[PDB]
Write a protein that binds this ligand. Structure first.
Ligand SMILES: CCCCCCCCCCCCCCCCCC(=O)OC[C@H](COP(=O)([O-])OCC(O)COP(=O)([O-])OC[C@@H](COC(=O)CCCCCCCCCCCCCCCCC)OC(=O)CCCCCCCCCCCCCCCCC)OC(=O)CCCCCCCCCCCCCCCCC
Ligand SMILES: CCCCCCCCCCCCCCCCCC(=O)OC[C@H](COP(=O)([O-])OCC(O)COP(=O)([O-])OC[C@@H](COC(=O)CCCCCCCCCCCCCCCCC)OC(=O)CCCCCCCCCCCCCCCCC)OC(=O)CCCCCCCCCCCCCCCCC
Ligand SMILES: CCCCCCCCCCCCCCCCCC(=O)OC[C@H](COP(=O)([O-])OCC(O)COP(=O)([O-])OC[C@@H](COC(=O)CCCCCCCCCCCCCCCCC)OC(=O)CCCCCCCCCCCCCCCCC)OC(=O)CCCCCCCCCCCCCCCCC
Ligand SMILES: CCCCCCCCCCCCCCCCCC(=O)OC[C@H](COP(=O)([O-])OCC(O)COP(=O)([O-])OC[C@@H](COC(=O)CCCCCCCCCCCCCCCCC)OC(=O)CCCCCCCCCCCCCCCCC)OC(=O)CCCCCCCCCCCCCCCCC
Ligand SMILES: CCCCCCCCCCCCCCCCCC(=O)OC[C@H](COP(=O)([O-])OCC(O)COP(=O)([O-])OC[C@@H](COC(=O)CCCCCCCCCCCCCCCCC)OC(=O)CCCCCCCCCCCCCCCCC)OC(=O)CCCCCCCCCCCCCCCCC
Ligand code: HEA
Ligand code: HEA
Ligand code: CUA
Ligand SMILES: [O-][O-]
Ligand SMILES: [Cu+2]
Ligand SMILES: [K+]
Ligand SMILES: [Mg+2]
Ligand SMILES: [Zn+2]
Ligand SMILES: [Zn+2]
Lengths: 90, 459, 107, 47, 91, 123, 65, 98, 65, 49, 121
């Protein structure tokens, strides 16, 4: 089990956790596979994950985006505030 | 007799006595450094004699690690109480125990004799080639000491492992700490011996491993493969002592005994596969750096569990018991100090942060808080706890609140500024420095002279 | 985890209405450095040290039983300072179980 | 650029490259977490 | 220093005969430790170490007055221009 | 059962003796290390050399971000720098009247030549 | 070890390894550094000074030298 | 006057109910009074859960309310940066050989 | 025998000869000298002075002493 | 339960440094755009001594 | 609340004062502290309270200072560090008057927040 207090595992799944020695082995094996899978399935795969046009936009993104879009803040935020180096000296 | 004695308890005393004696030379070397770093410009070392300073830092590091702290925590206390904590009478291999302490002394005499007779040059305690293999004979002598010290460490590790066969009681947390430290020595020492032989081959047998077409980074891998387990070998016995002191002096059963034991085991396994965080700036592969950085952070998880288990040991203890005993204060001080050292270790584990903080005094302060304060205080705390059993006297340390307070304040003055200096930035292993770092270096120097004065008060 | 011994309600019923927890002092007394006599030679000072061992002390309860000095670890069970030979007789670690055999009993 | 007297410079100072800024921001990002770890533990060091 | 007798929130509970036992006192006495001059010297002391630990030794400033002034002039005359409140700081 | 030194110290309240000892030990440490440098007056800490460093910093625009950040912090609230109030070297005790007169003449000459070059550059 | 703290560079100069470091300097200035690997008697006496100037200034400087 | 009413209301609502023991213990025999004495090792006096929340909640409001007070009254906002004007750099580096 | 019960019986029973303690302290003192004496010897060998004068390797004012 | 106080105390003190970092990033974004401390065509090569 | 709702077999004191008693004490002298709150020579046993009469489980609490000075003594009779004061008197007061406790804790927290924020900012 992952991020699971084993006292809960003992209580709610007595038959499954009846053999504690076997249960300990599964704990090691399960987390061994996860670590192995992360390297070869999340990190390794080549030429993948570069579709930057498909950035995930969660509902919280749209809630804040629409709130600023409704007002002028979004337009004001995106506006370039300064595009010159020196100010004119009077 | 005095040299022929095989009694393990006597040998344990000899380890403590020898560490103090060698400690004086280590303290002298440490004092030479901070006096020189008081301000820019030479103070006690001539500009034409800068080679001596390199030897001072090299010996300061070597003596303190292999000749002072390791014998004190792994040879001194364990040889005294470990057979007592076990229900057995004496150590399993009595004759081996005798030769181990004698070996440590002979290696010390070889090292100090080399100072007097050989030309004084330095290459750091890590002995990085090619600098180590283009030096004079003092480097050859230092190698002989390390190899000789390695023999004593391994045979002592064999001695402790045999307790599992004869132990007639329960394996307490302290016993586990010593056993796992022995396991680390058994697996790490042979690797160290192999690479040290290669250093000798280049120095003395015309080998070409550390010249062009021979990767010098090869040494760093093999050395640090032993190097980092060594720091964990130093501290793990300290963890065992803290567990005993806190439980005994608070009359509280050790909470989560199995969690403590598994934490020690986990640290050793992780500590054996994270050595390359000492090699971030050499230009390792991207995936390699990510792996070591990720696994290095994981070491905090088991180390954190032990910290919290210690805290609950002190919480809720009876108020009527006097809490001003030096042993209790030192044990509590260790938790506060170790957290500082460990947290800074996690900061420098991030490799991009380490790019700026490698080879700076921030790293110095990191391992001083853990070793110079934490390990020493743990060794002091254990010796104080066993004062009645050991039976030493003629010192005022058992109930001395002035010594504890002054030591804590002044050691923090030495090494807190060194964190700040790290960002300024001041490199390590340096005698001169820019004028604008004087203020912080001056404050630490005042801290160093103050600490030495405090030691005279114990007598 | 350990949370003390289990207690049944019947075990808490007193045999008298005036029973209260016994007020026996478990402070062994006032101590300091062991103070030897100048007249005592090496042998007799050793006897003096052996007679000042806190781990040989106990507190006698009202029923005649004594609660001795106890420690979590056996390091506190040897004479202080530690003698050359400590555990001449192997310390016994007492385990408890519910198993029994008929030979031990008689009808 | 150069060290200056009695400066904490916690996390670094005076970046001149985008990578230099990254080093400082990374330390500042973790610094509050370090304080939380220390304060939470130390507050419970007591009887 | 013949401290006073503080009767407390409930005066009835301090109304008995104290004999030789000490009598309760105002809380200011605790902070002054009965005006022990050495607690006050050790007090003046406490503030000095604290000040050095967080702000540095400001007891050296009277001796550093002349050399600080020269440093201030050098920054203003030859150092990089400061703006606004930045002029208050000299390195 | 203790010598005079401990009997004297252990008699006093801990928080009376402790703060005095902390200050005393620190003061002794500073005094001990100051013994070996009485009257040492390096030229690089003289006013003339200090001014020259300021000239170099202005030309090199040294640490522009710290100066910017210091101004920003001060505008917002209370900002205190040790460098502002404390000496940066330990030889300040002896160098109240020390000067390097050779540097003063050279620096003045270079400043005069620079003024000529500036006028020529203005053209 | 070639260290320039302001540029965020600390790369070990190891025999047999030609390590590659990329940088992009944003502001002009002079950035000081020191060797960050113990290398012998004068490890403390081989500083690193890098001065960044405008591209037009650099082009003129490069041509002259 | 109002303080007394609110004080009484909070006092009544915060009186603790008997704890729901998370440990297996027997029932004390009926009619059993005081059996121990005051020389027993002191047991820390702990607030009841309701009181702890109210007191703890008040501190959280206090600390962050104080933070807002400082930021709005004691501290000040940055004024706009001074205008950047074209300045003349020094003619020569002070160490340029002559 | 009663005398042999305790390890280091003379010391533990507070009858030992003080010379043993003096030798231990002397041994520690000699160990410390291994850091100071070679410092003085090496300084003289390469400079002709046992110890430097502070900042003697840098430019000093005329009145410096 | 008391340990929660340490968590809340640590969170508050940690949040103080978050605010400082937050203001620091705002200041840095304005350095190259508006700060007069930022100068160009200023540093000239010293040349070999 | 151990005596109030958890355990009914320990003696329960009366609060003499929700503030500590300041007293000057001398090293080498033994003092006896009232654990019932009914003595009239607080914070010391007067010879007529429950502690003096050994009634209802109340006994005098022995105490001895290491050094001479002025020390704070528990008036609430429940401080963890009794006889000495450690702040339990305020804690026990908040249990009795939680509304007042909120006001003090808010005020103390407000001051701490302002000073810490003002200096760091
Ligand atoms: C096929 C080819 C054939 C070829 C054939 C060729 C043959 C060649 C042969 C080659 C072999 C030669 C050697 C053979 C050895 C035989 C052993 C044997 O059987 O002995 C029985 C024999 C029995 O003696 P006995 O005749 O019955 O009489 C004994 C007494 O009556 C009372 O009995 P006891 O045992 O109690 O008395 C002994 C003891 C009794 O005295 C004491 O113990 C004194 C009281 C203690 C005071 C406190 C000391 C400090 C605390 C130390 C704590 C750690 C101790 C560790 C254990 C001890 C280690 C030695 O005193 C000593 O022996 C000296 C003790 C030294 C302790 C050292 C502690 C550390 C010192 C740190 C120095 C720091 C400064 C640095 C600079 C200097 C560096 C050197 O053994 C001994 O007792 C004597 C041993 C003497 C030999 C020791 C050799 C040491 C060499 C060290 C290396 C030096 C090289 C570099 C030189 C540099 C100089 C500066
Ligand atoms: C596809 C491939 C499949 C392959 C399948 C292969 C199948 C192999 C089956 C193996 C079955 C083993 C059966 C024997 C079990 C052990 C029994 C035993 O030792 O009897 C005691 C026996 C003494 O007899 P006794 O009188 O019954 O002892 C009474 C007790 O002393 C009195 O104590 P007590 O009664 O209070 O407590 C009893 C017990 C108390 O202790 C226990 O009960 C411990 C129980 C757990 C042991 C570990 C089991 C494995 C756990 C799973 C690990 C899976 C990792 C997967 C990784 C996959 C990656 C791909 O005591 C002991 O066990 C004492 C011995 C402990 C030695 C530990 C040495 C360090 C090893 C690391 C510790 C284990 C960490 C596991 C991982 C932790 C993190 C999750 O011990 C000895 O004879 C001592 C000999 C000492 C020799 C030392 C020198 C050996 C050479 C060293 C070379 C370097 C080693 C490097 C190690 C690195 C470690 C990190
Ligand atoms: C910056 C000013 C510097 C002043 C100079 C330094 C003066 C010396 C101070 C020495 C203090 C020692 C205290 C005892 C050690 C602590 C152990 C402990 O806590 O356990 C006690 C006790 C445990 O039970 P126990 O068995 O009775 O004690 C065992 C002892 O360890 C057994 O140890 P023992 O055998 O050695 O016996 C010690 C015994 C006897 O202790 C003594 O003799 C100490 C008596 C108190 C003296 C305090 C003098 C303060 C003078 C302040 C001057 C301020 C102006 C400076 C100039 C500013 C210019 C801008 O202690 C007691 O009876 C415990 C009393 C409770 C602790 C009181 C600590 C706070 C005192 C008030 C500090 C006020 C600072 C204001 C700063 C304002 C700056 C502008 O209960 C506690 O743990 C107490 C909890 C904490 C209560 C106090 C809370 C802090 C005070 C309010 C805030 C103050 C800061 C405001 C800043 C505002 C800035 C704008
Ligand atoms: C880190 C520091 C801070 C630490 C703080 C924390 C500490 C916490 C506490 C730790 C406690 C740990 C456990 C302690 C257990 C103690 C058990 C015990 O006492 O065992 C009994 C044990 C022995 O007692 P025993 O049973 O009566 O033994 C009877 C003997 O076996 C038999 O009696 P005997 O009379 O027959 O004895 C034979 C005696 C025969 O005696 C004599 O004949 C003596 C004649 C007088 C000689 C005196 C020395 C002369 C020196 C002259 C120098 C001239 C220089 C000229 C310079 C000219 C320059 C121009 O000696 C010998 O024959 C052999 C001597 C060999 C060893 C001594 C070596 C000395 C150094 C040599 C250096 C060589 C350098 C060469 C370099 C060349 C390089 C090329 O005690 C000791 O050995 C003494 C231990 C003392 C310390 C006890 C612990 C106290 C607490 C710690 C205090 C602080 C210490 C700080 C370190 C030291 C700082 C300097
Ligand atoms: C109302 C007041 C203000 C409230 C604020 C609220 C804030 C939110 C928190 C949540 C709300 C809390 C509300 C609680 C309501 C009450 C609930 C309850 O049950 O009450 C009854 C309950 C128990 O009642 P009881 O059972 O009757 O017993 C009451 C007794 O009084 C016994 O009481 P106790 O045992 O609970 O005593 C607690 C004591 C217990 O503490 C200990 O025992 C500590 C022992 C170890 C001390 C270690 C000292 C430090 C070592 C440093 C190492 C280096 C040394 C260098 C030396 C150099 C040379 C000199 O805790 C402390 O002393 C606090 C330690 C906190 C961590 C310290 C480290 C701060 C580091 C911050 C980051 C630094 C970055 C630096 C950046 C650069 C510079 C700016 O009492 C409480 O809950 C009391 C809570 C009060 C805690 C106040 C702590 C304030 C500390 C402020 C630190 C500020 C740092 C500023 C710098 C920041 C830079 C970023
Ligand atoms: C006893 C000695 C000792 C100990 C225990 C440690 C422990 C650790 N060390 Fe240390 N280290 C040294 C001695 C030691 N080290 C020495 C001597 C060097 C320099 C060698 C040389 O270059 O010469 C060094 C160098 C060193 C480096 C830099 C190497 C280099 O590039 O030069 C790093 C980098 O990450 C590091 C990391 C760590 C970490 C992550 C731990 C961890 O074990 C710390 C874990 C502990 C904590 C984190 C605190 C406790 C936990 C908590 C409070 C809760 C959980 C916390 C978090 C999740 C953050 N060490
Ligand atoms: C155990 C190891 C240990 C210990 C205790 C110390 C203690 C001290 N060290 Fe350190 N030090 C190292 C290990 C240690 N050191 C290492 C490994 C390096 C890196 C080497 C290298 O650069 O290659 C180093 C580097 C190092 C440097 C950097 C040198 C340079 O790069 O130029 C400095 C500078 O001040 C320094 C100072 C100090 C000081 C002032 C003390 C102490 O004075 C601090 C306070 C301690 C005391 C006042 C003494 C207390 C008593 C004991 C420690 C002995 C106790 C004995 C028993 C209990 C038996 N140390
Ligand atoms: Cu090159 Cu150091
Ligand atoms: O080594 O950490
Ligand atoms: Cu490491
Ligand atoms: K120097
Ligand atoms: Mg390096
Ligand atoms: Zn009473
Ligand atoms: Zn109270």
């Amino acid at each position: 089990s992952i991020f699971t207090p084993m006292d809960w595992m003992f209580y709610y799944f007595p038959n499954y956790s009846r053999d504690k020695v076997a249960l300990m082995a599964r704990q090691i094996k399960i987390h061994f596979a996860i670590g192995f899978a992360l390297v070869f399935l999340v990190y390794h795969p080549p030429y993948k994950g570069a579709d930057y046009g498909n950035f995930h936009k969660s509902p919280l993104y749209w809630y804040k985006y629409n709130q600023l879009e409704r007002s002028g803040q979004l337009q004001e935020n995106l506006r370039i505030k300064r595009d010159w180096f020196y100010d004119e000296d009077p | 007799f005095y040299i022929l004695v095989n009694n393990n308890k006597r040998i344990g005393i000899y380890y403590i006595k020898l560490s103090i004696i060698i400690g004086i030379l280590g303290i002298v070397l440490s004092y030479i450094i901070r006096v020189e770093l008081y301000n820019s410009g030479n103070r006690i070392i001539k500009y034409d004699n800068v080679n001596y300073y390199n030897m001072v830092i090299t010996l300061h590091g070597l003596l303190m690690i292999f000749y002072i702290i390791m014998p004190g925590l792994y040879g001194g206390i364990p040889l005294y109480i470990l057979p007592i904590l076990s229900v057995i009478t004496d150590i399993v291999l009595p004759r081996i125990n005798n030769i181990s302490i004698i070996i440590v002394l002979i290696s010390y005499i070889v090292v100090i004799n080399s100072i007097v007779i050989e030309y004084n040059i330095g290459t750091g305690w890590t002995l990085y080639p090619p600098l180590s293999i283009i030096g004079t004979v003092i480097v050859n002598m230092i190698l002989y000491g390390l190899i000789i010290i390695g023999i004593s460490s391994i045979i002592s590790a064999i001695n402790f492992m045999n307790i599992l066969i004869v132990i007639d009681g329960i394996i307490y947390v302290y016993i586990w700490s010593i056993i796992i430290t022995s396991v680390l020595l058994i697996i790490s020492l042979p690797i160290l011996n192999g690479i040290l032989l290669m250093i000798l081959s280049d120095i003395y047998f015309n080998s070409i491993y550390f010249i062009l077409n021979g990767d010098v980074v090869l040494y760093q891998h093999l050395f640090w493969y032993f190097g980092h387990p060594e720091v964990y070998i130093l501290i793990l016995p300290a963890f065992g002592i803290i567990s005993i002191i806190l439980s005994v002096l608070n009359n509280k059963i050790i909470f989560g005994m199995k969690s403590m034991i598994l934490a020690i085991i986990m640290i050793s396994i992780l500590g054996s596969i994270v050595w390359a965080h000492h090699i971030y700036t050499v230009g390792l592969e991207l995936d390699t750096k990510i792996y070591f950085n990720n696994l290095t952070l994981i070491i905090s998880i088991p180390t954190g569990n032990k910290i919290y288990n210690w805290i609950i040991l002190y919480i809720g203890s009876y108020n009527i018991l006097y809490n001003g005993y030096q042993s209790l204060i030192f044990s509590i001080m260790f938790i506060i100090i170790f957290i500082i050292g460990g947290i800074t270790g996690i900061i420098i584990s991030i490799d991009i942060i380490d790019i700026g903080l490698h080879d700076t005094y921030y790293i110095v302060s990191h391992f001083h808080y853990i070793l110079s304060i934490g390990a020493v205080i743990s060794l002091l705390a254990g010796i104080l706890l066993l004062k009645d059993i050991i039976g030493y006297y003629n010192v005022i340390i058992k109930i001395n609140k002035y010594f504890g307070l002054l030591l804590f304040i002044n050691i923090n003055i030495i090494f807190t500024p060194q964190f700040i200096i790290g960002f300024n930035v001041m490199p390590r292993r340096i005698l001169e420095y820019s004028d604008n770092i004087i203020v912080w270096n001056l404050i630490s120097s005042i801290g160093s002279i103050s600490t030495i004065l405090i030691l005279l008060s114990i007598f | 985890i350990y949370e003390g011994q289990t207690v049944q309600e019947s075990e808490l019923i007193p045999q008298e209405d005036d029973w209260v927890i016994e007020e026996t002092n478990f402070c062994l007394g006032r101590n300091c450095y062991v103070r030897f006599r100048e007249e005592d030679d090496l042998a007799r000072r050793a006897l003096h040290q052996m007679d000042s061992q806190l781990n040989k002390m106990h507190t006698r309860l009202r029923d005649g039983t004594v609660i001795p000095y106890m420690s979590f670890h056996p390091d506190e069970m040897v004479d202080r300072p530690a003698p050359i030979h400590t555990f001449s007789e192997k310390p016994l670690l007492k385990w408890t179980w519910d198993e029994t055999y008929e030979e031990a009993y008689d009808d | 650029d150069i060290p200056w007297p009695a400066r904490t410079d916690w996390g670094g100072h005076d970046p001149a490259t985008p990578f230099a800024e990254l080093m400082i921001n990374t330390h500042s990002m973790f610094w509050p977490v370090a304080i939380f770890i220390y304060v939470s533990a130390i507050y419970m060091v007591k009887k | 220093y013949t401290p006073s007798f503080e009767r407390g929130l409930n005066p009835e509970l301090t109304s008995g005969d104290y004999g030789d036992m000490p009598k309760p006192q105002p809380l200011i006495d605790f902070f002054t430790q009965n005006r022990n001059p050495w607690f006050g010297f050790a007090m003046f002391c406490g503030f000095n170490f604290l000040w050095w630990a967080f702000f540095g030794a400001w007891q050296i400033r009277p001796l550093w007055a002349s050399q600080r002034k020269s440093l201030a002039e050098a920054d203003r005359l030859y150092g990089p221009t400061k703006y606004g409140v930045g002029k208050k700081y000299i390195n | 059962d203790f010598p005079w030194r401990w009997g004297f110290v252990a008699e006093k309240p801990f928080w009376v003796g402790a703060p005095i000892l902390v200050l005393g030990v620190l003061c002794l440490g500073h005094i001990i290390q100051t013994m070996g440098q009485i009257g040492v007056r390096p030229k690089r800490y003289t006013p003339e050399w200090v001014e020259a460093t300021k000239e170099r910093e202005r030309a090199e625009n040294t640490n522009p971000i710290t100066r910017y950040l210091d101004r920003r912090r001060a505008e917002r609230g209370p900002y205190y720098l040790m460098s502002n109030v404390l000496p940066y070297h330990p030889h300040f005790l002896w160098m109240r009247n020390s000067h390097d007169y050779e540097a003063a003449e050279a620096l003045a000459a270079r400043r005069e030549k620079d003024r000529e070059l500036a006028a020529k550059l203005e053209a | 070890s070639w260290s320039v703290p302001s540029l965020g560079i600390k790369c070990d100069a190891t025999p047999g390894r030609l390590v590659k470091i990329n940088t992009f300097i944003q502001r002009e200035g002079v950035f000081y550094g020191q060797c960050s690997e113990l290398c012998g008697t004068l490890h403390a006496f081989m500083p690193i000074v890098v001065e960044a100037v405008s591209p037009e200034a650099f082009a003129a400087h490069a041509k002259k030298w | 006057a109002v303080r007394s009413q609110i004080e009484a209301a909070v006092y009544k609502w915060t009186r603790p109910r008997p704890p729901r023991l998370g440990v297996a213990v027997p029932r004390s025999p009926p009619g059993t009074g005081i059996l121990f004495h005051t020389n027993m090792q002191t047991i820390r006096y702990s607030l009841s859960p309701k009181v702890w929340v109210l007191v703890t909640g008040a501190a959280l409001v206090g600390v962050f309310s104080g933070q807002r007070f400082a930021q709005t009254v004691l501290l000040s906002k940055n004024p706009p940066n001074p205008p950047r004007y074209r300045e003349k750099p020094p003619v020569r580096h002070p160490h340029t050989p002559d | 025998n009663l005398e042999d019960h305790f390890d280091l019986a003379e010391y533990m029973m507070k009858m030992h000869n003080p010379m043993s303690e003096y030798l231990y302290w002397i041994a520690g003192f000699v160990s410390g000298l291994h850091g100071i004496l070679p410092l003085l010897h090496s300084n003289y060998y390469f400079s002709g002075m046992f110890l430097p004068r502070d900042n003697d390797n840098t430019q000093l004012c005329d009145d410096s002493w | 339960r008391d340990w929660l106080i340490g968590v809340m105390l640590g969170m508050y003190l940690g949040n103080l440094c978050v605010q400082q970092h937050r203001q620091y990033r705002v200041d840095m974004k304005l350095f190259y755009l508006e700060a007069p401390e930022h100068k160009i065509n200023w540093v000239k090569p010293r040349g070999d001594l | 609340t151990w005596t109030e709702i958890w355990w009914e077999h320990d003696p329960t004191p009366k609060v003499a004062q929700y503030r500590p008693y300041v007293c000057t004490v001398e090293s080498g002298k033994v003092y006896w502290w009232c654990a019932c709150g009914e003595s009239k020579t607080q914070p010391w046993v007067d010879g007529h309270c429950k502690c003096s009469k050994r009634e209802g489980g109340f006994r005098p609490r022995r105490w001895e200072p290491e050094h001479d000075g002025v020390r704070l003594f528990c008036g609430c009779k429940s401080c963890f560090s009794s006889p000495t004061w450690n702040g339990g008197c305020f804690t026990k007061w908040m249990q009795s008057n939680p509304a007042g406790g909120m006001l003090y804790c808010f005020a103390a927290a407000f001051g701490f927040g302002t000073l810490t924020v003002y200096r760091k900012f």
